[PDB]
mmCIF file of C-alpha atoms and ligand atoms in Angstrom:
data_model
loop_
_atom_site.group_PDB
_atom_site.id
_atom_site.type_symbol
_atom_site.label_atom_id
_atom_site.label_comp_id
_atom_site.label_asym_id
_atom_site.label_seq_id
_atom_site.Cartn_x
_atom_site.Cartn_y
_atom_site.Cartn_z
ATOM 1 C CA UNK A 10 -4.326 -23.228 10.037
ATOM 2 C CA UNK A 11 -5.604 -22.234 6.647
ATOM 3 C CA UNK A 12 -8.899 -20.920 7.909
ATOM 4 C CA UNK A 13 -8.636 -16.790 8.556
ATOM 5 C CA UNK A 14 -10.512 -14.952 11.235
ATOM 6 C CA UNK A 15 -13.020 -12.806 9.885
ATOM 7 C CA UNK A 16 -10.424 -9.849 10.557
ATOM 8 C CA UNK A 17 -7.864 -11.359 9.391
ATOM 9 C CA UNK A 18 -9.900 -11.454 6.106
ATOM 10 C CA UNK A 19 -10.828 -8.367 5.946
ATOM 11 C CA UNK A 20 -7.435 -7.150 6.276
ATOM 12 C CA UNK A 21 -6.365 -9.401 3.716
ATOM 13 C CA UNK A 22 -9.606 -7.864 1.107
ATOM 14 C CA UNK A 23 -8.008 -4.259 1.940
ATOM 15 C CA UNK A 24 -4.634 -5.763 1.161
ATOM 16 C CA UNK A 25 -5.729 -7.864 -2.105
ATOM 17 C CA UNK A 26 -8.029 -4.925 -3.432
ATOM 18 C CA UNK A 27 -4.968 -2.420 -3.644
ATOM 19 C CA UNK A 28 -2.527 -5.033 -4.769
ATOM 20 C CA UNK A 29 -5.013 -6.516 -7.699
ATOM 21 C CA UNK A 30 -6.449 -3.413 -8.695
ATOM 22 C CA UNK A 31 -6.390 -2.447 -12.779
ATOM 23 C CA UNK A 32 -7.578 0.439 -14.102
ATOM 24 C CA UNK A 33 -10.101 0.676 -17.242
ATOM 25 C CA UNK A 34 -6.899 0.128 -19.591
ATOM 26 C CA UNK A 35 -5.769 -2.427 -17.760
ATOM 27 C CA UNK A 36 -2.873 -1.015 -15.598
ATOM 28 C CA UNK A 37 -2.195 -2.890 -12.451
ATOM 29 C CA UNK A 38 -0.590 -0.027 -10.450
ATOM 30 C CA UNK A 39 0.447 -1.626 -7.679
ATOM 31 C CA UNK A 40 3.324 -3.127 -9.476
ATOM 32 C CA UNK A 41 5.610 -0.116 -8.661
ATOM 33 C CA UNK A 42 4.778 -0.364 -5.098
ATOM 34 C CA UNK A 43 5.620 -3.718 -3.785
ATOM 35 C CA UNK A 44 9.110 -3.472 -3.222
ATOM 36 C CA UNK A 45 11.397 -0.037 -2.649
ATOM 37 C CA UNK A 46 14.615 0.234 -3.901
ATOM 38 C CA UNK A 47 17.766 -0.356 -1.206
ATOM 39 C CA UNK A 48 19.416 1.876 0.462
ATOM 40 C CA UNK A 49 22.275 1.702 -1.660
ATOM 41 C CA UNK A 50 20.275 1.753 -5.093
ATOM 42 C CA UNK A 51 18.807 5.104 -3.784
ATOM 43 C CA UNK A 52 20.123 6.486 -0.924
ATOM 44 C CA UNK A 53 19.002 10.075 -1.244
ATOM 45 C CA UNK A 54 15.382 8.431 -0.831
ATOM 46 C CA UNK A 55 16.199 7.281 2.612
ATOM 47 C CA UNK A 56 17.701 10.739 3.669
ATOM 48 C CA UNK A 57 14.354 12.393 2.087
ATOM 49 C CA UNK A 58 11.340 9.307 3.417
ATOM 50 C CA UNK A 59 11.860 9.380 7.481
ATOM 51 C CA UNK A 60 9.587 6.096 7.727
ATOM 52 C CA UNK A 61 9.916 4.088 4.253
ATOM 53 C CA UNK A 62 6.784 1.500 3.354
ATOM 54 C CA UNK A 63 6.128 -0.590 0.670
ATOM 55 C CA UNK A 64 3.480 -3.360 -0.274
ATOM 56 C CA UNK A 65 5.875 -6.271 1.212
ATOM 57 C CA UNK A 66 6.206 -4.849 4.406
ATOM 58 C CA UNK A 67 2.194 -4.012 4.761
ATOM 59 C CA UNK A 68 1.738 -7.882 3.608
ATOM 60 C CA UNK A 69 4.565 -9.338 6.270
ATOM 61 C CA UNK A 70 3.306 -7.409 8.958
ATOM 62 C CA UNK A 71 -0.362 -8.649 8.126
ATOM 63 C CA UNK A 72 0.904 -12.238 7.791
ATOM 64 C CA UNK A 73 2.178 -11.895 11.402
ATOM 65 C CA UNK A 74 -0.834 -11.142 12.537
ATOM 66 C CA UNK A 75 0.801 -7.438 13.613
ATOM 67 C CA UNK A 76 -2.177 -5.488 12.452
ATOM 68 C CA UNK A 77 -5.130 -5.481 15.076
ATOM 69 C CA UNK A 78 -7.578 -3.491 13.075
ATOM 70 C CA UNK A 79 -8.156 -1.919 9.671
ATOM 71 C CA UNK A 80 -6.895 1.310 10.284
ATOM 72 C CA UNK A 81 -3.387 0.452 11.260
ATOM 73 C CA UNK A 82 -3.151 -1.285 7.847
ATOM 74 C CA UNK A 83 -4.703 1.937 5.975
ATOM 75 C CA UNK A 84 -2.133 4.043 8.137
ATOM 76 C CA UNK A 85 0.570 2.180 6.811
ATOM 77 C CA UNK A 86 -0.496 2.312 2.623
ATOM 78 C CA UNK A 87 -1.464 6.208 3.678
ATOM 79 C CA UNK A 88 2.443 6.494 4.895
ATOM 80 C CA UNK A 89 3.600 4.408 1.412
ATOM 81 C CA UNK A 90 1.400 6.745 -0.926
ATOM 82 C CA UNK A 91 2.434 9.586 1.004
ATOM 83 C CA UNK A 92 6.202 8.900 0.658
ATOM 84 C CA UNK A 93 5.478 8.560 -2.710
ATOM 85 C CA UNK A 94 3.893 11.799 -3.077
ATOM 86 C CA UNK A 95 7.048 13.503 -0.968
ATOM 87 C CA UNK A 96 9.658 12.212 -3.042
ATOM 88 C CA UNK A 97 8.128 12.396 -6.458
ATOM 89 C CA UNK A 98 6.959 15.672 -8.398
ATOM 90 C CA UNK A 99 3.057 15.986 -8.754
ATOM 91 C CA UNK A 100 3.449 15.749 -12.495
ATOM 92 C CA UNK A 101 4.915 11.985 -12.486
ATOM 93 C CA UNK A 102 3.710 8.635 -12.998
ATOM 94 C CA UNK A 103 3.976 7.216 -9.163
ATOM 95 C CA UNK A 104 2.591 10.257 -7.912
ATOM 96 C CA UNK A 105 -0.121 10.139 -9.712
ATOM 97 C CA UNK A 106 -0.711 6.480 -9.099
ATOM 98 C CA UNK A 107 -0.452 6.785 -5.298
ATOM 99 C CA UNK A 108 -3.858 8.967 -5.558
ATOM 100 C CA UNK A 109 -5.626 6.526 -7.373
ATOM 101 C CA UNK A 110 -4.858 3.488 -5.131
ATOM 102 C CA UNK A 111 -5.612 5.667 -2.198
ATOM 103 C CA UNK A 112 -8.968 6.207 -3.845
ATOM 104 C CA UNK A 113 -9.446 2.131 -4.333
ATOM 105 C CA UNK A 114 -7.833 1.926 -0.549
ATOM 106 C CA UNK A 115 -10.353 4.258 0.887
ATOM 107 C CA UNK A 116 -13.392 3.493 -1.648
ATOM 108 C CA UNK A 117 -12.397 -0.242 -0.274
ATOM 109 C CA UNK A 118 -12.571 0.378 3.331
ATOM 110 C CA UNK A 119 -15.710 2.238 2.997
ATOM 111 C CA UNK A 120 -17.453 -0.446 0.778
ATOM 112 C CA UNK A 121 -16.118 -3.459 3.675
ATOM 113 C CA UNK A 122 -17.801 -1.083 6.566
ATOM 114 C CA UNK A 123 -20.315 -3.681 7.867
ATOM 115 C CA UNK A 124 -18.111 -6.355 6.577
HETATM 116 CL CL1 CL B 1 -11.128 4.284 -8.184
#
């Protein structure tokens, strides 16, 4: 039961590195990302994002074992950062921040290659 597959680890390592992830000042800038605001909160985001994604919905689909490979869970943090990047001005914080955790998202991938 408690005892992951070594995908289902690695998954989880992609999933933990982007979550846990601090910067050199400390920063862990994930926080932002975990949960969008509703539809009623923000509503002109959900007329602007055609296929919202946040951090909860990468880990729930992971936890349901609905991921069969690493790249389906990189596709889906690509999709959050790149919502991010649609709805947000270059200039602004969670722009910005969506670059650098698709650096430690990618940098992470690459690093796990051979496991
Ligand atoms: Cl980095």
């Amino acid at each position: 039961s408690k005892y992951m597959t070594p995908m289902q680890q690695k998954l989880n390592e992609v999933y933990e590195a982007v979550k846990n992830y601090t910067d050199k000042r400390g920063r862990r800038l994930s926080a932002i990302f975990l949960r969008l605001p509703s539809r009623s909160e923000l509503p002109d985001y959900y007329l602007t994002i055609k296929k919202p994604m946040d951090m909860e919905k990468i880990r729930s689909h992971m936890m349901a074992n609905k991921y069969q490979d690493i790249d389906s869970m990189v596709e889906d943090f690509v999709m959050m950062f790149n919502n991010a990047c649609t709805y947000n001005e270059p200039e602004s914080l969670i722009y910005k921040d969506a670059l650098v955790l698709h650096k430690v998202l990618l940098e992470t991938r690459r690093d796990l290659e051979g496991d």
